[PDB]
Enzyme design. Structure first.
Site, PDB file in Angstrom:
ATOM      1  N   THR B  70     133.918   3.765 -52.923  1.00 44.87           N
ATOM      2  CA  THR B  70     134.013   2.715 -51.916  1.00 44.87           C
ATOM      3  C   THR B  70     133.719   1.307 -52.412  1.00 44.87           C
ATOM      4  OG1 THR B  70     133.523   4.274 -50.157  1.00 44.87           O
ATOM      5  CG2 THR B  70     133.167   1.931 -49.685  1.00 44.87           C
ATOM      6  N   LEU B 104     123.145   1.181 -52.583  1.00 45.08           N
ATOM      7  CA  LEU B 104     123.482   0.596 -51.279  1.00 45.08           C
ATOM      8  C   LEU B 104     122.277   0.634 -50.352  1.00 45.08           C
ATOM      9  CD1 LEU B 104     126.998   2.174 -50.576  1.00 45.08           C
ATOM     10  CD2 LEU B 104     126.364   0.317 -52.120  1.00 45.08           C
ATOM     11  N   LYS B 109     121.053  -4.030 -53.818  1.00 51.55           N
ATOM     12  CA  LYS B 109     122.334  -4.339 -53.170  1.00 51.55           C
ATOM     13  C   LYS B 109     122.612  -5.846 -53.055  1.00 51.55           C
ATOM     14  CE  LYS B 109     124.842  -3.317 -48.833  1.00 51.55           C
ATOM     15  NZ  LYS B 109     125.495  -4.612 -48.491  1.00 51.55           N
ATOM     16  N   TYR B 154     125.481  -6.193 -43.676  1.00 49.78           N
ATOM     17  CA  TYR B 154     125.961  -4.859 -43.355  1.00 49.78           C
ATOM     18  C   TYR B 154     125.001  -4.059 -42.470  1.00 49.78           C
ATOM     19  CZ  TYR B 154     127.997  -0.270 -43.537  1.00 49.78           C
ATOM     20  OH  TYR B 154     128.519   0.958 -43.187  1.00 49.78           O
ATOM     21  N   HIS B 238     140.291   4.113 -50.958  1.00 49.14           N
ATOM     22  CA  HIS B 238     140.599   5.329 -51.702  1.00 49.14           C
ATOM     23  C   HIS B 238     141.011   6.409 -50.696  1.00 49.14           C
ATOM     24  CE1 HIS B 238     137.027   6.841 -49.865  1.00 49.14           C
ATOM     25  NE2 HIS B 238     136.325   5.845 -50.368  1.00 49.14           N
ATOM     26  N   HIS B 349     135.511  12.087 -52.880  1.00 47.42           N
ATOM     27  CA  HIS B 349     136.482  11.288 -53.610  1.00 47.42           C
ATOM     28  C   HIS B 349     135.799  10.701 -54.832  1.00 47.42           C
ATOM     29  CE1 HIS B 349     134.595   7.779 -51.627  1.00 47.42           C
ATOM     30  NE2 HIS B 349     134.517   8.616 -50.607  1.00 47.42           N
ATOM     31  N   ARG B 619     142.414  -4.743 -74.583  1.00 49.80           N
ATOM     32  CA  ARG B 619     143.265  -5.835 -75.049  1.00 49.80           C
ATOM     33  C   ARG B 619     143.327  -5.857 -76.572  1.00 49.80           C
ATOM     34  NH1 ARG B 619     141.584 -11.286 -72.328  1.00 49.80           N
ATOM     35  NH2 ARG B 619     143.484 -11.853 -73.488  1.00 49.80           N
ATOM     36  N   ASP B 621     142.973  -6.512 -80.368  1.00 51.38           N
ATOM     37  CA  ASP B 621     141.763  -6.963 -81.050  1.00 51.38           C
ATOM     38  C   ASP B 621     141.970  -8.265 -81.816  1.00 51.38           C
ATOM     39  OD1 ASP B 621     140.117  -4.898 -80.140  1.00 51.38           O
ATOM     40  OD2 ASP B 621     140.419  -3.662 -81.923  1.00 51.38           O
TER      41      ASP B 621
HETATM   42  C1  LIG Z   1     140.829  -8.247 -66.708  1.00 51.19           C
HETATM   43  O1  LIG Z   1     140.645  -9.611 -66.412  1.00 51.19           O
HETATM   44  C2  LIG Z   1     139.419 -10.164 -66.836  1.00 51.19           C
HETATM   45  C3  LIG Z   1     139.345 -11.585 -66.261  1.00 51.19           C
HETATM   46  O2  LIG Z   1     140.638 -12.136 -66.136  1.00 51.19           O
HETATM   47  C4  LIG Z   1     139.323 -10.066 -68.362  1.00 51.19           C
HETATM   48  O3  LIG Z   1     137.998 -10.294 -68.777  1.00 51.19           O
HETATM   49  C5  LIG Z   1     137.805 -11.656 -69.200  1.00 51.19           C
HETATM   50  O4  LIG Z   1     138.250 -11.874 -70.514  1.00 51.19           O
HETATM   51  C6  LIG Z   1     137.958 -13.191 -70.906  1.00 51.19           C
HETATM   52  C7  LIG Z   1     138.879 -13.615 -72.047  1.00 51.19           C
HETATM   53  O5  LIG Z   1     140.222 -13.517 -71.603  1.00 51.19           O
HETATM   54  C8  LIG Z   1     136.479 -13.136 -71.240  1.00 51.19           C
HETATM   55  O6  LIG Z   1     136.077 -14.280 -71.960  1.00 51.19           O
HETATM   56  C9  LIG Z   1     134.918 -13.963 -72.754  1.00 51.19           C
HETATM   57  O7  LIG Z   1     133.711 -14.454 -72.185  1.00 51.19           O
HETATM   58  C10 LIG Z   1     132.551 -13.878 -72.787  1.00 51.19           C
HETATM   59  C11 LIG Z   1     131.317 -14.471 -72.109  1.00 51.19           C
HETATM   60  O8  LIG Z   1     131.548 -15.880 -72.009  1.00 51.19           O
HETATM   61  C12 LIG Z   1     130.528 -16.592 -71.287  1.00 51.19           C
HETATM   62  O9  LIG Z   1     129.308 -16.746 -72.002  1.00 51.19           O
HETATM   63  C13 LIG Z   1     129.330 -17.590 -73.146  1.00 51.19           C
HETATM   64  C14 LIG Z   1     127.926 -17.665 -73.741  1.00 51.19           C
HETATM   65  O10 LIG Z   1     127.410 -16.360 -73.888  1.00 51.19           O
HETATM   66  C15 LIG Z   1     129.854 -18.984 -72.798  1.00 51.19           C
HETATM   67  O11 LIG Z   1     129.924 -19.792 -73.951  1.00 51.19           O
HETATM   68  C16 LIG Z   1     131.239 -18.830 -72.178  1.00 51.19           C
HETATM   69  O12 LIG Z   1     131.833 -20.079 -71.889  1.00 51.19           O
HETATM   70  C17 LIG Z   1     131.129 -17.951 -70.927  1.00 51.19           C
HETATM   71  O13 LIG Z   1     130.336 -18.568 -69.937  1.00 51.19           O
HETATM   72  C18 LIG Z   1     132.518 -14.148 -74.294  1.00 51.19           C
HETATM   73  O14 LIG Z   1     131.717 -13.119 -74.889  1.00 51.19           O
HETATM   74  C19 LIG Z   1     133.879 -14.203 -75.018  1.00 51.19           C
HETATM   75  O15 LIG Z   1     133.756 -15.163 -76.087  1.00 51.19           O
HETATM   76  C20 LIG Z   1     134.601 -14.893 -77.232  1.00 51.19           C
HETATM   77  O16 LIG Z   1     135.914 -15.419 -77.093  1.00 51.19           O
HETATM   78  C21 LIG Z   1     135.970 -16.832 -76.952  1.00 51.19           C
HETATM   79  C22 LIG Z   1     137.395 -17.252 -76.562  1.00 51.19           C
HETATM   80  O17 LIG Z   1     138.140 -17.759 -77.649  1.00 51.19           O
HETATM   81  C23 LIG Z   1     135.431 -17.488 -78.227  1.00 51.19           C
HETATM   82  O18 LIG Z   1     135.408 -18.885 -78.042  1.00 51.19           O
HETATM   83  C24 LIG Z   1     134.016 -16.992 -78.541  1.00 51.19           C
HETATM   84  O19 LIG Z   1     133.611 -17.433 -79.817  1.00 51.19           O
HETATM   85  C25 LIG Z   1     133.907 -15.464 -78.475  1.00 51.19           C
HETATM   86  O20 LIG Z   1     134.409 -14.866 -79.657  1.00 51.19           O
HETATM   87  C26 LIG Z   1     135.078 -14.565 -74.130  1.00 51.19           C
HETATM   88  O21 LIG Z   1     135.244 -15.978 -73.957  1.00 51.19           O
HETATM   89  C27 LIG Z   1     135.709 -13.004 -69.926  1.00 51.19           C
HETATM   90  O22 LIG Z   1     134.357 -12.646 -70.119  1.00 51.19           O
HETATM   91  C28 LIG Z   1     136.323 -11.966 -68.991  1.00 51.19           C
HETATM   92  N1  LIG Z   1     136.157 -12.407 -67.621  1.00 51.19           N
HETATM   93  C29 LIG Z   1     135.892 -11.566 -66.630  1.00 51.19           C
HETATM   94  C30 LIG Z   1     135.755 -12.186 -65.273  1.00 51.19           C
HETATM   95  O23 LIG Z   1     135.750 -10.352 -66.786  1.00 51.19           O
HETATM   96  C31 LIG Z   1     139.679  -8.675 -68.874  1.00 51.19           C
HETATM   97  O24 LIG Z   1     139.873  -8.757 -70.262  1.00 51.19           O
HETATM   98  C32 LIG Z   1     140.934  -8.112 -68.221  1.00 51.19           C
HETATM   99  N2  LIG Z   1     141.156  -6.725 -68.603  1.00 51.19           N
HETATM  100  C33 LIG Z   1     142.285  -6.286 -69.171  1.00 51.19           C
HETATM  101  C34 LIG Z   1     142.375  -4.827 -69.516  1.00 51.19           C
HETATM  102  O25 LIG Z   1     143.245  -6.996 -69.426  1.00 51.19           O
HETATM  103 CA   LIG Z   2     140.238  -5.231 -77.846  1.00 53.34          CA
HETATM  104 ZN   LIG Z   3     135.159   4.150 -49.356  1.00 53.76          ZN
HETATM  105 ZN   LIG Z   4     133.403   8.281 -48.805  1.00 54.76          ZN
END
Ligand SMILES: *[C@@H]1O[C@H](CO)[C@@H](O[C@@H]2O[C@H](CO)[C@@H](O[C@@H]3O[C@H](CO[C@H]4O[C@H](CO)[C@@H](O)[C@H](O)[C@@H]4O)[C@@H](O)[C@H](O[C@H]4O[C@H](CO)[C@@H](O)[C@H](O)[C@@H]4O)[C@@H]3O)[C@H](O)[C@H]2NC(C)=O)[C@H](O)[C@H]1NC(C)=O
Ligand SMILES: [Ca+2]
Ligand SMILES: [Zn+2]
Ligand SMILES: [Zn+2]
Ligand SMILES: *[C@@H]1O[C@H](CO)[C@@H](O[C@@H]2O[C@H](CO)[C@@H](O[C@@H]3O[C@H](CO[C@H]4O[C@H](CO)[C@@H](O)[C@H](O)[C@@H]4O)[C@@H](O)[C@H](O[C@H]4O[C@H](CO)[C@@H](O)[C@H](O)[C@@H]4O)[C@@H]3O)[C@H](O)[C@H]2NC(C)=O)[C@H](O)[C@H]1NC(C)=O
Ligand SMILES: *[C@@H]1O[C@H](CO)[C@@H](O[C@@H]2O[C@H](CO)[C@@H](O[C@@H]3O[C@H](CO)[C@@H](O)[C@H](O)[C@@H]3O)[C@H](O)[C@H]2NC(C)=O)[C@H](O)[C@H]1NC(C)=O
Ligand SMILES: *[C@@H]1O[C@H](CO)[C@@H](O[C@@H]2O[C@H](CO)[C@@H](O)[C@H](O)[C@H]2NC(C)=O)[C@H](O)[C@H]1NC(C)=O
Ligand SMILES: *[C@@H]1O[C@H](CO)[C@@H](O)[C@H](O)[C@H]1NC(C)=O
Ligand SMILES: *[C@@H]1O[C@H](CO)[C@@H](O)[C@H](O)[C@H]1NC(C)=O
Ligand SMILES: *[C@@H]1O[C@H](CO)[C@@H](O)[C@H](O)[C@H]1NC(C)=O
Ligand SMILES: *[C@@H]1O[C@H](CO)[C@@H](O)[C@H](O)[C@H]1NC(C)=O
Ligand SMILES: [Ca+2]
Ligand SMILES: [Zn+2]
Ligand SMILES: [Zn+2]
EC number: 3.1.4.1
Lengths: 816, 737
Positions: B70, B104, B109, B154, B238, B349, B619, B621
């Site tokens: 849920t 929950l 929560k 809630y 679900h 579920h 994604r 590497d």
């Molecule tokens: C599903 O969709 C989500 C969101 O759209 C995707 O997850 C996001 O992926 C992005 C990149 O596309 C992630 O970005 C990463 O953020 C991490 C944390 O960043 C914060 O913290 C640092 C300090 O610790 C701050 O400086 C920064 O500004 C943020 O506040 C970092 O660990 C990562 O940094 C690495 O990459 C960058 C980019 O070039 C480099 O500059 C760095 O040196 C480092 O190597 C990165 O930036 C983000 O966290 C995700 N967001 C969310 C909301 O989840 C999923 O990938 C996607 N899933 C699939 C399967 O596609």
């Molecule tokens: Ca990867």
């Molecule tokens: Zn449910």
């Molecule tokens: Zn249920």
């Protein structure tokens, strides 16, 4: 002021009744329970009586709701101060409250077609009327129909008490070679009396001067013995269900000299919705509710005439329903090609015969065809059966109307000749094995005769003929129901059943015969100590001790008309030995939990019982390297733990029977691994094994005339080979009690076919644990089935009443 | 006066609003545990929801996210994110870095640290759009220090009618106080689903109850003149399934009664050790997982280290997710023992989100959604973008393909584009000079230079090899900076990474009449002179190498012209590192299966290639990360693919070969590349059985491949981008039946 008559109408007054009132706080103080809660409650209350009619409401309490037939359950009770039948609390009708015109309560047989037992199990809470009848009446979670599970055969079985093989109507479509005509509901042949054999209950009533009003029923628009029911309707499915009920309610109001004591009533739902849309569809839920309201209509009807405590209602169904699938349809054209020389009755209980009518019909060689179709595919969901090799529990062989070649389908599966023959394959269907759970049927008995709120174990619908005879006060025609087996459904039983008596006196076998050479090389392993011969002077009069250990529930009683029998006592078993056949009719023994039994090899070692005449077929020489057949033991050889040697008594010539080598596989496994397990799992087990002779496949023990005719010569020696082998397991219900001291009994029974190969089981690739145990389960049978086919009678010395034992004996487990 | 349900269907081409309303708002109405099937079977007992379906835009199944619980799914709907990303991976969970547990029933929560990502009401807030959430997961929490403008803490005891009247009253508020986005949440039919099971009387009642409340709302809107001026998404989180005490796995059977482990019971059970969090990372889950693998003949549970779960589930990238997860067969559930689990007879579920009974309800009705349009299944994460387009909001980055649901709308707001190429398309001239690769080729094989001379006879016909290899357009390289060659051959086109000295993808077309050779081609490689010679391209390197072998991205047995083996297939630019055990899977797939699909589909188009997702974030590497996961095997540095992808394509009309499709049929897989086959518990089975089962389990969206490889398919296809976005996001439901 209130919102009555003003729901969502106008605003001018000090308080409003429209959806704007909730945001403003202007709502009149009853707005909620006047205009909103009616939108999704289905029940009346003080605020809703004489309400404005609104579409939005689930349900009406407006005065104009009677005309439209959309009042709530409690429009009568809340808003008109008097209740419907369904609403009144359960009351015990110990004696029937009838009007003065009524001298006794009549019975009404109300059939809902294709109402599978499960519908009430699952959808009971959507069906308050039928649920009340159940809770206030006598219910069973399953009523077993007859095979095939089709509409005509079962409807006619209910009112005859006969198996379809006997009563003539074996399917809604059928062909008779001796009449050279076909039967069809859509045909004029429907009304030909020659099809409907047996005696229906309304004909029984007629012969004993009891009137009958049948609204619809199979047979009732036909001159069976030149007799119709006093009132009857020619079938017309277009007649609305309400007319059907009003018409019987009117017949009840007729003067006593015109008035029926027996009534039937028949509706085509939920069956119709079952086919068109399947058994788990919206349409079936609707059909179910529709039919629940009509059962309610009738009950209110009877309540209005003061008859609702003066009527014996059987609410019943013919069969259940199952979901079909184009992915689970077998077509024979795949194995045969497109052929013109055969007709197939399509369905789950498909049957086959050749086209020529009837010259080709008997000499067609169905064997060859059946073998062709056997074991063609890895998990074949159809299995061809020559009709005498179907399971005996189905009672589906003894009729010319039944084709020589039948097919047994797995649950959910159906067979046709090709895709064009069958109905649409996505539909719901029925006709399958009558022990499949979804073919099980509905039965509720409510009235001044039936117990209130009693639930009982499943019984077969053929038992109902006798019940209705007992309710109407009629002497029943000979049927296949065990009279008195349903006494536990009744407050006060009319019939007290008896155990059948033994036909003749028993003869003596004294130890007279001199030893001949049987031609057996016994191992040194075996222990025939010189003293062994003494054992033959054991008699049954060795009171209990060993006698009770062998037949703790009473010894089987011989019902065979004139048949010379000895009782041969041994230490661990008792054999009932036929002098007429020179063969044991039954052996009875008790395998206690702690008992062992040896897997030493006892090939080619027999001990001539000196008490019986020496037949050439008792000799080892006779079977010595005999490819055609072998022999088997009715009681397995068991170990003497103090000596650690085998009881030689099992190797006595009076304990063997002719037995194909292939069947020995089944027979060995059953004794080697299974009987040990059951003994362990039930704190001991009591066995009664024996041969079976039913060459005319009429389900009953063969005449001595008929046995003569089916004797054969194998090594230039005359021998008679059993059609089947029976076995009857018995143990206590309380696992703390060994079979020698049961308070209540647990009974299984089997009638295993004795075939010279195992093609039935399609063994290739399988393991014996898998295929043998499957075979037993398939050939499970009622204890009564054994009794009928052997001429024996079990459990007679048991303390329980006869009707109690008749339940035990008629029982059969449901598959799944 | 008729009620709403009673009125004939009418096409709302432009929204008929009151003068106070400058545009139609959207209402997200959730019915918990309303499995798609309820409407399939019981639709005729549900006239209101049936009218919304028939007058709106429907799909027979909306795929939820895994686990099918849920909280994860409710929060995915309003975020567009996978649970692995948005933080709420289950209604019960534990975080090692916070050293706290989420419940929950707990005060936790309301701790913001759990709820990551951006919910739509927060998106609305940032762009000055008001929001009234009656109930929803997250909405009684300060996510970015922001609550919805109107919101309720809630309380499940609040009768359903109050919930609806309250939204109807918020709609009547003055424009400066009034929400443009609304949520509404009911706990039925879910509750009746657990207590009494799906297919019970109680569920039929719950269903009808909820149908009347949807009706109450519709009449409500009709009374305010809003029923042609509101965009309703009626949705579920679900589905539901029947449990059984006969289908419950207990680990104490294989482990004994142990105190050192906690198990999250259910169909998507997870395990971690008790010590919090000192033992947690260095516990040796491998050993345990292997202990529990293949213990019984038809085991209905399968232990998975979370990076080896199917990639389609997107269930690995979070500390909140325990290292050891379990995959259960339909209807089955796992607990540590009988005492841990809920009552086993209940409905439940959480199972694989592709099981049919876990599928969910979606109906879109309003002046934006087409009337009486039925569409193919889409995932609920796609809804975040849809509601942004409906509210007029720029969406936060999510996992939904923006524009993939345009076909649900009368007039699309967003027109998606194909992503452009960023890799460095470099030349590969034939320069390299032949070294000894150390291969003993059979005499059977035809050499490469002759291959063209050989080639003419019986092969003359004029037709195009580039189109024959990539008829839908060549994959586009989205890898940020990555040096790539396009290497053309006669029957395939390989996209070759100079950075990795390894093919990123090969593309070819197996025509129905193409011959398949049965010749034996062991230890024979042909040095592609166009690419740099790596020590890992040499046969000598793999010669009797127990550790690993190699595999071909395009089968050498496939050959248009003759019975002989295709020599260009044995080029060093067509091989990849490949465990011997995986070769079993890879061989069967090409030897028997590909031939069959080619036959059954009038030809088939393949794009195979390696995959590198060592951080298991779904994604492609970073080159930094690839460096770190390189290893040395024969004292030679090599980087072994985490998975292998394959993308099958053929025409819908069986009369058309893949080179001339009017419309495309797409399958896609992301096969795990594991050095054994314990996943498949092979003992006793046949390869036909267990390999095909494995493919099916690891089927994936084309888009899943795109995300994890950095490639982009079908770009040259005539169809619009949003059309292709449907094709790419599709996944088949596992049918129960
Ligand atoms: C599903 O969709 C989500 C969101 O759209 C995707 O997850 C996001 O992926 C992005 C990149 O596309 C992630 O970005 C990463 O953020 C991490 C944390 O960043 C914060 O913290 C640092 C300090 O610790 C701050 O400086 C920064 O500004 C943020 O506040 C970092 O660990 C990562 O940094 C690495 O990459 C960058 C980019 O070039 C480099 O500059 C760095 O040196 C480092 O190597 C990165 O930036 C983000 O966290 C995700 N967001 C969310 C909301 O989840 C999923 O990938 C996607 N899933 C699939 C399967 O596609
Ligand atoms: Ca990867
Ligand atoms: Zn449910
Ligand atoms: Zn249920
Ligand atoms: C289920 O229940 C039914 C009824 O209880 C049983 O069916 C009866 O079974 C018996 C035996 O199978 C049947 O009895 C036989 O009927 C034959 C036909 O009888 C009529 O036709 C002859 C002309 O040929 C007339 O003269 C006669 O009066 C009848 O009108 C007879 O051919 C049989 O005769 C044989 O037995 C007699 C013994 O009296 C011998 O002297 C003869 O030489 C001959 O061998 C016999 O009478 C009876 O017809 C069946 N009735 C019905 C309604 O079907 C089933 O057996 C039962 N099944 C179970 C319990 O499993
Ligand atoms: C969570 O929600 C439930 C449901 O609203 C709350 O229970 C409700 O409590 C209220 C107040 O205690 C009750 O309201 C009624 O008040 C009038 C007074 O005139 C009286 O006539 C009624 O008998 C009743 O007392 C009501 O019983 C109850 N249910 C509903 C539907 O309102 C609960 O208090 C909420 N808060 C929590 C759990 O913290
Ligand atoms: C079993 O019992 C019978 C008695 O029923 C014994 O029969 C006697 O046998 C002796 C010796 O053979 C004869 O001389 C008698 O004529 C028989 N009957 C008597 C005396 O009543 C028989 O010997 C016993 N056999 C065994 C093995 O114990
Ligand atoms: C069958 O019943 C309907 C009931 O209205 C009637 O109209 C019709 O004429 C009947 N047909 C026959 C043949 O009795
Ligand atoms: C069954 O009959 C078909 C022709 O109808 C024949 O070709 C075939 O050989 C037969 N038997 C088997 C086992 O296939
Ligand atoms: C985590 O929680 C446990 C629970 O008591 C506590 O003992 C421990 O100190 C906490 N922190 C760490 C780093 O283990
Ligand atoms: C699984 O764990 C149990 C714990 O008692 C152990 O006995 C068994 O050998 C283990 N299996 C392994 C280590 O493969
Ligand atoms: Ca017989
Ligand atoms: Zn019927
Ligand atoms: Zn029917």
């Amino acid at each position: 002021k209130s919102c009555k008559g003003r729901c969502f109408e106008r605003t001018f007054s000090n308080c409003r009744c429209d959806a704007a009132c909730v945001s403003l706080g202007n709502c009149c103080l009853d707005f909620q329970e006047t205009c909103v809660e009616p939108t999704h409650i289905w029940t009346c209350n003080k605020f809703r009586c004489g309400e404005k009619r609104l579409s939005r409401f689930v349900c009406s309490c407006a005065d104009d709701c009677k005309t439209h037939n959309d009042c709530c359950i409690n429009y009568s009770s809340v808003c008109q101060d008097k209740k419907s039948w369904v609403e009144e609390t359960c009351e015990s009708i110990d004696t029937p409250e009838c009007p003065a015109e009524f001298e006794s309560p009549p019975t009404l047989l109300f059939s809902l077609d294709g109402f599978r037992a499960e519908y009430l199990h699952t959808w009971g809470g959507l069906l308050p009327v039928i649920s009340k009848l159940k809770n206030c009446g006598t219910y069973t979670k399953n009523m077993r129909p007859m095979y095939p599970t089709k509409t005509f055969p079962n409807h006619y079985s209910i009112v005859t008490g006969l198996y379809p093989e006997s009563h003539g109507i074996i399917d809604n479509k059928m062909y008779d070679p001796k009449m050279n005509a076909s039967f069809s509901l859509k045909s004029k042949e429907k009304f030909n009396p020659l099809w409907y054999k047996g005696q229906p209950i309304w004909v029984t009533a007629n012969h004993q001067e009891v009137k009958s009003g049948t609204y619809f029923w199979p047979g009732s628009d036909v001159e069976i013995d030149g007799i119709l029911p006093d009132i009857y309707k020619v079938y017309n499915g277009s007649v609305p269900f309400e007319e059907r009920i009003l018409a019987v309610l009117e017949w009840l109001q007729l003067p006593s000299h015109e008035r029926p004591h027996f009534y039937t009533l028949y509706l085509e739902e939920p069956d119709s919705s079952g086919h068109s849309h399947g058994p788990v569809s919206s349409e079936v839920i609707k059909a179910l509710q529709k039919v629940d309201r009509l059962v309610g209509m009738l009950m209110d009807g009877l309540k209005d005439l003061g008859l609702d405590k003066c009527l014996n209602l059987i609410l019943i169904s013919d069969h259940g329903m199952e979901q079909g699938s184009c992915k689970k349809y077998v077509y024979l054209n795949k194995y045969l090609g497109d052929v013109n020389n055969v007709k197939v009755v399509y369905g789950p209980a498909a049957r086959l015969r050749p086209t020529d009518v009837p010259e080709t019909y008997y000499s067609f060689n169905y064997e060859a065809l059946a073998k062709n179709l056997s074991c063609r595919e890895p998990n074949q969901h159809f299995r061809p059966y020559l009709k005498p090799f179907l399971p005996k529990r189905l009672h589906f062989a003894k009729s010319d109307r039944i084709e020589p070649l039948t097919f047994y389908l797995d649950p959910q599966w159906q067979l046709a000749l090709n895709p064009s023959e069958r109905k649409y394959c996505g539909s719901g269907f029925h006709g399958s094995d009558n022990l499949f759970s979804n073919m099980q049927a509905l039965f509720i008995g409510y009235g001044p005769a039936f117990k209130h709120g009693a639930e009982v174990d499943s019984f077969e619908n053929i038992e109902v003929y006798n019940l209705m005879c007992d309710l109407l006060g009629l002497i029943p025609a000979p049927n296949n129901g065990s009279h008195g087996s349903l006494n536990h459904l009744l407050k006060k039983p009319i019939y007290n059943p008896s155990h059948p008596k033994e036909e003749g006196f028993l003869s003596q076998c004294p130890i007279k015969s001199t030893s001949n050479d049987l031609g057996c090389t016994c191992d040194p392993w075996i222990v025939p100590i010189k003293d062994f011969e003494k054992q033959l002077n054991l008699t049954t009069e060795d009171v209990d001790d060993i006698y009770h250990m062998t037949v703790p529930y009473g010894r089987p009683r011989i019902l065979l008309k004139q048949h010379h029998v000895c009782l041969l006592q041994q230490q661990q078993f008792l054999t009932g030995y036929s002098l007429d056949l020179l063969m044991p009719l039954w052996a009875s023994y008790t395998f206690l939990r702690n008992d062992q039994f040896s897997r030493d090899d006892f090939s080619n070692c027999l001990y001539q019982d000196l008490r019986i005449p020496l037949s050439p077929v008792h000799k080892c020489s006779y079977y010595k390297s005999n490819s055609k057949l072998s022999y088997g033991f009715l009681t397995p050889p068991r170990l003497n733990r103090v000596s650690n040697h085998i009881y030689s008594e099992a190797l006595l010539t009076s304990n063997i029977v002719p037995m194909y080598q292939s069947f020995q596989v089944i027979w060995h496994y059953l004794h080697d691994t299974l009987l040990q397990r059951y003994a362990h799992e039930r704190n001991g087990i009591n066995v009664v094994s024996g041969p079976v002779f039913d060459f005319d496949y009429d389900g009953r023990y063969d005449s001595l005339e008929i046995l003569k005719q089916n004797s054969r010569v194998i090594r230039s020696q005359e021998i008679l080979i059993p059609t089947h082998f029976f076995i009857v397991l018995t143990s206590c219900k309380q696992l703390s009690e060994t079979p020698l001291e049961c308070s209540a009994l647990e009974s299984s029974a089997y009638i295993l076919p004795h075939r010279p190969d195992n093609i039935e089981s399609c063994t290739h690739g399988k393991r014996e644990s898998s295929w043998v145990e499957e075979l037993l389960t398939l050939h499970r049978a009622r204890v009564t089935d054994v009794e009928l086919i052997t001429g024996l009678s079990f459990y007679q010395d048991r303390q329980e009443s006869v009707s109690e034992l008749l339940r035990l004996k008629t029982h059969l487990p449901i598959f799944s």
